[PDB]
Write a protein that binds this ligand. Structure first.
Ligand SMILES: [Fe+3]
Ligand SMILES: [Fe+3]
Ligand SMILES: [Fe+3]
Ligand SMILES: [Fe+3]
Lengths: 270, 276, 278, 269
């Protein structure tokens, strides 16, 4: 019960979506290869270097910064299958709200329990009856250990009747992960970062937070250089707001320019 | 007393009373909102663009046009900075929301022979919001300016007051519950995305009904229009408030006070070359 | 209670049910190929309907739709439907001796999408008070062939009828909806009814399904058609058979009464007078 | 140096024709009232905004501007100078092109040129060629050397070889305030200036007239029938809706079935 179910290579995307619906969190083992993890870390380290006790480090605008995030991660088939299964029929389309690298180094103080969808009071007031909004893919660019303070979760807290109750830390299960392993969770599930005993090792994660088409992304990508945008696939461009969305509700389109496809209107390929 | 109608708001009415009428009734009429000169140049700025859209198998009973900020200077400056619209927006979204922006700005033209519209709520396009019915959060705020006279004969828009509070939004009411909104000049009608309404039939063989709608969203709801193709020279001519209305500035929700719609956790318009 | 009962009956039996009850359901009227050909030809015209330039949405889907002037717009309606032998047999039997000739007053595609309100009980010939005042003793005028271009279900609002209401002595009485029985049809199926038969469209309970129909409303020669077809391009009028041209008012009528003819130009055949072949 | 020879507020139209004969360019002061300039800018602004770089060009003025339809096409000074410019043998004339020109910040300096070069058979006659193009250049905004006021070489319409466009140091700038006009021939060397100003846009209205026998650049037959019917017969002839009456072929030219054309297509006698 007080455990986060693991999903292996033999797990189908339907079962990952089902584990997410019942528990609010799931671990996808062996998601990214160690060679892809290092390629990500190699592309990201110089940007982080252009940033007393160690403090928390963060970085976003990944598409401008990382080619592997631009191509491999934004086009990953498992993430997109889980997205279509999580939002389901009535929603139809989705895009990325936040892509961020998170660093919690030695001596990092422990985080309070929280739900990310608290930034949306109108949805957060619905508690577990609220619609699906945030889908969070947390990839481990380094090992997630108990001592460096791996993120803890409270399974089933996405269904609680009162979201003012964030639970207590003894109901939280640590998510022990290896590099390249992923943890998927909802914006309604209680979680918190851990304290880092390890005063020699830095914990590192890449979060991809998705929204349904009708919820405004946190990240704005108009400043991404045109050449990298034209190098991306149309799916990856739709993820970063450069293409029009196609909700099942308004199938004709949303996020249009003069009732026409947005990316075509400002120079991208049809 | 024996009869009820959409309430009018005169020049001596404050914006607080307009917000009050708006969420008791879901609809309000602001008399003499635009001066005759503003209506005249708005129509003048819009005529050549409509003529280029519609100059060329099908009779044209209906015309639509959007992307107004690129197209109209009076819309770019006068309407997008209008003080009453922003007072009512702040009052409608209130404390918990904080910031807002424009989702859709469109001119609508219904000429002779246009059929009556079905009763509807504009917010049905958001089923996750629509399913909460009258308990749902404020989302759409619609400002409908009359660029021509609104008569029942040319199909003045009809409304059902109080239908924004209904417990079941699968119920759109009946035409016997609808009251017509008669407007003459650049008078305005404000309504919610939860209030049932419909356009009328244009019985006249001569007269064209013309309106300008401005549909606003809270910061967290995706605007229908994308304004990335607006030329930089016209965006730079706009005030920062109007730039935020068309999505070129970051929003500042009360919930996430640090900001939303950012570039590298910094203000978006400055990040892409606009003035701080 | 409506007879969905024309699997194998000939047109004479159809005229017999059509008087006795005022409404009849003809099974398998159009082949699935013709229904697909009609829907394909009609889709672009319905899509362009009131605003050809824009998509006519701005988050406002159009639930109710109407379209006419079909002969200019659809070739299969121009050829297959206007020349259909069963329709002309039924018109023959319904108008009978005294009338002689007939033509089409209205050819229309009708669409009721999700959320469409239920219709009031009515008779179409109420548009002619001088005829409507005669009630059941009045002359035959309107004959309506309603083809289902989609399934006619109880939930999407299939049209309801009151059999025998064409014979009532007082047409101020339109009945009540408990006397109405729904007409359930497949794609190729048709319902025929008179302008004196009480009917109403249903409510569309479905959240996505769109109900679509093609109505062909015919008149006797002496009653003015609702549609004017003179703006039809002459290439299309010349591609039509003389029967189909007479149906859309491009040829003169031959009433039983004034055998010499009606709707002439200088007392001569009209279509020849305006450049069509004899 | 040469200078442009300003005029108006007391000069007769014969004097303007004579200055045009001698220099090929002249400046008419206070040609339009400030109120007329404000109508023109008000009527033209929405059409300029919908035309879809600060440079802009627009024509088909009679459909678009009432003040152009009535005030400018009927202006008495323009017609006196036109009859003086074409003179005896020509007789009748009409407008070939009416256009608003907009040149904003960053506008490059133009090459020295002669507009009549679009007519190689006429242009090859150099200074001895017949009068063809007559250009009226009205200032809808201030014309400053800082915003690129047009420069001219007086007397260059006279030159024996039109392959010589002269040099940029023989050029005189034409400074105009607002509603001031500069008239010039299609044979006079000229060029638009560079607009260094980071802030200001230059607006001009050009009216280019032809003798009766030269084809107008603009076709005005798509002009709406009730705006043409609102125009004076003189203004209707300027836009090609009435027959011309050259002194050469006095019976008429540009006819319909050897009858007056505007009457033939439904206009008033
Ligand atoms: Fe969190
Ligand atoms: Fe609406
Ligand atoms: Fe009916
Ligand atoms: Fe030039």
């Amino acid at each position: 019960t007080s455990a986060i179910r693991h999903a292996n290579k033999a797990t189908s995307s339907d079962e990952i979506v089902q584990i997410l619906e019942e528990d609010g969190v799931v671990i996808v083992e062996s998601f990214l290869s160690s060679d892809l993890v290092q390629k990500l870390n190699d592309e990201l380290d110089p940007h982080l270097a252009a940033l007393h006790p160690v403090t928390t480090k963060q970085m976003n605008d990944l598409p401008a910064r990382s080619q592997t995030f631009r191509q491999d991660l934004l086009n990953n088939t498992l993430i997109h299958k889980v997205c279509e299964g999580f939002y389901g029929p009535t929603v139809g389309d989705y895009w990325m709200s936040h892509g961020g690298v998170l660093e919690r180094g030695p001596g990092t103080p422990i985080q309070s329990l929280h739900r990310d969808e608290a930034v949306f009071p109108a949805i957060h007031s619905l508690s577990g009856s609220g619609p699906p909004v945030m889908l969070h893919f947390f990839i481990a660019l380094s090992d997630f250990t108990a001592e460096n303070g791996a993120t803890q979760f409270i399974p089933g807290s996405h269904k609680w009747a009162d979201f003012n109750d964030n639970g207590t830390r003894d109901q939280a299960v640590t998510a022990i992960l290896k590099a390249g392993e992923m943890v998927i969770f909802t914006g309604k599930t209680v979680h918190c970062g851990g304290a880092n005993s390890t005063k020699d090792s830095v914990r590192r994660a890449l979060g991809m937070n998705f929204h349904p088409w009708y919820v405004t992304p946190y990240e704005n990508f108009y400043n991404t250089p045109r050449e990298v945008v034209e190098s991306m696939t149309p799916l990856a461009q739709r993820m970063i707001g450069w293409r029009t969305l196609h909700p099942h509700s308004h199938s004709f389109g949303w996020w249009l320019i003069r009732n026409a496809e947005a990316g075509q209107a400002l120079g991208l390929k049809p």
